[PDB]
Amino acid sequence: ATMKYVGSIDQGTTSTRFIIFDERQRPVSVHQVPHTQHTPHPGWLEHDPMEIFRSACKCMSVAIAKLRQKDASFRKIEAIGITNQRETTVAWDRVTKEPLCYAPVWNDLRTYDITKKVTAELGGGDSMFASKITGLPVSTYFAAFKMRWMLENVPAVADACRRGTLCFGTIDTWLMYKLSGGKAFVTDVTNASRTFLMDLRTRKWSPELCEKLKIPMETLPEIRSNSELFGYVETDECGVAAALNERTPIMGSIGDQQSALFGNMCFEKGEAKNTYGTGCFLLMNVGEEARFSKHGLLSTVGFQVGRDGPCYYALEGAIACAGATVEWMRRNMNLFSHITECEKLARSVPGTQGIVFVPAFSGLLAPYWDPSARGTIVGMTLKTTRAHVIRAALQAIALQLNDVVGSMKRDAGLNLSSLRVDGGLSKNGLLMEIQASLLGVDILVPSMHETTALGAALCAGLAAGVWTSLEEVKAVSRRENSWKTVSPSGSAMEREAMIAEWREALKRTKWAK
Amino acid sequence: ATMKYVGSIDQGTTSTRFIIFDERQRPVSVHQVPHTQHTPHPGWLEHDPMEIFRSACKCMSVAIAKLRQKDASFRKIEAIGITNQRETTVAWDRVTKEPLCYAPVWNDLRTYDITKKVTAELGGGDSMFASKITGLPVSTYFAAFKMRWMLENVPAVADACRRGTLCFGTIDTWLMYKLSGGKAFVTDVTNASRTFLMDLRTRKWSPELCEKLKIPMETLPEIRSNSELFGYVETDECGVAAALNERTPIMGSIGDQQSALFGNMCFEKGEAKNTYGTGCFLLMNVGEEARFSKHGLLSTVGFQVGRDGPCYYALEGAIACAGATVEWMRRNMNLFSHITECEKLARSVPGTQGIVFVPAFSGLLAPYWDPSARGTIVGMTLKTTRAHVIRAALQAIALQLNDVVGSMKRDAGLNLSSLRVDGGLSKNGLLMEIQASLLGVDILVPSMHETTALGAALCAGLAAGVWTSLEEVKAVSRRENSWKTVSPSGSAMEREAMIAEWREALKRTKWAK
Ligand SMILES: CCCCc1cc(=O)oc2c(O)c(O)ccc12
Ligand SMILES: CCCCc1cc(=O)oc2c(O)c(O)ccc12
């Protein structure tokens, strides 16, 4: 037994990557390819499904080739895992194998009207109507409403449903389909948990809802766990089956945010993760029993290692403008030029001294869904510099995440144990300190940042016996991959003063329509 | 009929100038000398009267020495005019001919307590109790309270009162005293209007107010008009009688703002001036009858040509943060560097696209009155840029002016005829365009921008026959000096939405204490 290897396809909003991990959980090869962000109308975003599948195959054969020149005794990958951008919905044909049309992406707003009609004509105007089934409000994000929009507005996709050809799938299903050659038509529970068609507690499709929303269940794939035989890679798109050499199983499929949870060893209830990027998603493991939300937050599947494995559930909240706020201060406002000046400028001052900046540029998410909320700054005087604004933008992210976490503590009935953080903005020391102070917990910053991709590789390693227990996983991690830990430090009437200010700033934010 | 020349001493907060004008109303010589800003305690400001007097003298003889070197037709100054920082109060002794202490400046805060005590005990808690007599509210600015402060806190002044050698005087009075060698103890109507001791209906000192604030009337100079024989220069302090050569009468005397009103030719009722400086002072001529405000605006004297000539009254409004908001965006927020960029960045976008920036850094003055209001921005999206923010600051300035003008029109019972503009921000044509479009009158931008100095030069030259009427003053300006006219150029519907957004934004500015 020499060095075994597990591959992860990371199919994100703006690019696709393939990372190869070894049995020590180290990324040893990686390759990235971008895809086009088609915006036909304002607020619309579409991806081209064949560009994504193509990107993924290019990623695999370049990653393989590169590893095979740093380890010339590398004959095979044990298994492939997939993690992907969730909610993004593809429509394809049973026999022609091709996309009927482009894939509306998770944050697309073409499903606006369909979202209105549904809440009214099915929920009696209550957005939470189906939420004890799914765990979700009715929104433009989820996969069913996109399914609905295409069936309605796309000649080709209408006919495909008519003829009994039509397949529908999130990006995990699509990738697993095209990688197979048509063989497997499958999804994992976490991904399925975002369709608006799956029962959260049972992890089975709801025939109530599919029929209530007129989606022919012929179009839907078979649900499985995150960690088991899904299919085999055997397409020849960019030499990919050739490059792998042996028949390679796909034994790993898991949505992106939950992959970051799993990748961060957030296995026990209480353990939570935050992924900074353009925005934030926070997910907390809540345990083997599903918890529902009185604050807006989503309930979703955290993970499920194996067919009839214990299924852990989670709560989920988002902030829309996290790293976008920093990048906005830079490129839109000229408040600094170089990425590190941001942090240095915020430190250069002691407080925000009066000011609050609430960066609700595209609305308020979290536990106050106000899409009339806009970007706002209150309390300025002639003493206000860009440093205070910069510092206040970071305080505001951390304050939203506080409001978010507090809403989870009540919904979940337990504390936040600790908080793992990954992404651009977690390299910011000051934000991590402010974040810790307000939550009063440890913030663990992993120095192997590649944890979204690691998630899917863990799934497929467990299912294929590269590791065997979630404990060996925890132990290999602890040994191999270090982490910076940042503790809370500060007062209680600082914390409560900062929030009292925040509460008052939030009243002043309502503006659009 | 040889060339005639009028001189204007322009004694400001931070410096003194002497500008000599020719009969074409052209500035032909200038010299500027600054004086020391004495700050004994935070909030306090004080000027040395003797340093101020010498400055004026230096300015005169230097500017005269320069002119006779560059103009062979300059033989003499026909008359001298004075324009001055108002409200600044000088306590001197009629036998030593010298000050008993330094002079507290208009914006000095050491009179605050005295001011609160006058409001409570003389006004029953009403700061406006004397506003139908004086045109003014109880405030730190006004002369009477500085006079009162100096009796109560300055032994030398209190002694001088007792001994009956005390002269109180605004800077017009101090300058005409010392230029006389102590022979003239006069003030002009406009400066008297800022003492809190003059009755606007009579333009005479109010026996009741003198009695109630306990300033004896023997301390006070004689009230005369803006344009008449005050005195003659007969000091040789810094060579100034030597430089003037012939006997030179002092025949003009007018407070700085009113001077600008008059240098801007606002002789008829409904004609207004606005100075776009660090802040904004807008004065409108309301005609021969005083008008009082229901919106916190000051009623004041505008001008009076001739001993007991017709007396034109004004309303006065201020905005605190004009050029200061421009300076803040550059200095504190790094939105631009070179001053030309402010206008170019604001022109580079076609509107503000929903944002509003209320630059209420030091509160709202003007016709809303909120010391709690702070600098606020609302409505930002990820499309918002420094360009939109800069343009909104400019809109904001014009919007407050619009409101101030609005109030004046209601209080005065008249329309705004035209707006003459001056100060540095008047060279920002986009601001002048936005302002025309908002008020829907023409804005007149004089190219000879020395409007404060010219006021005093016109008063003095009228009295000495250099110009024989206001019609002749107006005609020489047209012929000799260009005015750029700037016309309303947007839509009434855009006008209205800007005002609606402005009114919404104001509701979100309350922050402080
Ligand atoms: C307008 C309702 C949006 C629902 C939403 C809330 C949230 O806190 O996180 C989300 C989220 O993480 C998604 O991927 C999609 C939708 C939401
Ligand atoms: C503290 C109240 C100030 C009154 C005031 C109102 C205004 O509109 O303009 C003023 C002004 O232009 C002054 O020079 C002094 C006081 C005011």
TrEMBL record, chains A, B:
- What domain of life does the UniProt record list for this protein's source? Eukaryota
Q: Does the keyword Transferase apply?
A: yes
Name the positions where ADP 4 binds: R24, R26, R479, E480
The record's annotation in CDD domains points to: ASKHA_NBD_FGGY_GK1-3-like
Q: Which GO terms describe its molecular function?
A: ATP binding; glycerol kinase activity
Q: Does the keyword Kinase apply?
A: yes
Q: What is its EC number?
A: 2.7.1.30
Cellular component, GO annotation? mitochondrion
Matches recorded under Pfam families: FGGY_C (PF02782), FGGY_N (PF00370)
Transmembrane region positions?
A: none
Per UniProt, the keywords (alphabetical) are: ATP-binding, Glycerol metabolism, Kinase, Nucleotide-binding, Transferase
Gene Ontology biological process terms, A to Z? glycerol catabolic process; glycerol-3-phosphate biosynthetic process; triglyceride metabolic process
Taken from the UniProt record, the cysteine pairs bridged by disulfide bonds within this chain are C280-C321
**In this chain, where does the modification Phosphothreonine occur?**
T14, T278
Q: Which residues bind sn-glycerol 3-phosphate?
A: T13, R86, E87, D256, Q257, T278
Q: Which family does it belong to?
A: Belongs to the FGGY kinase family.
Q: What is this protein called?
A: glycerol kinase
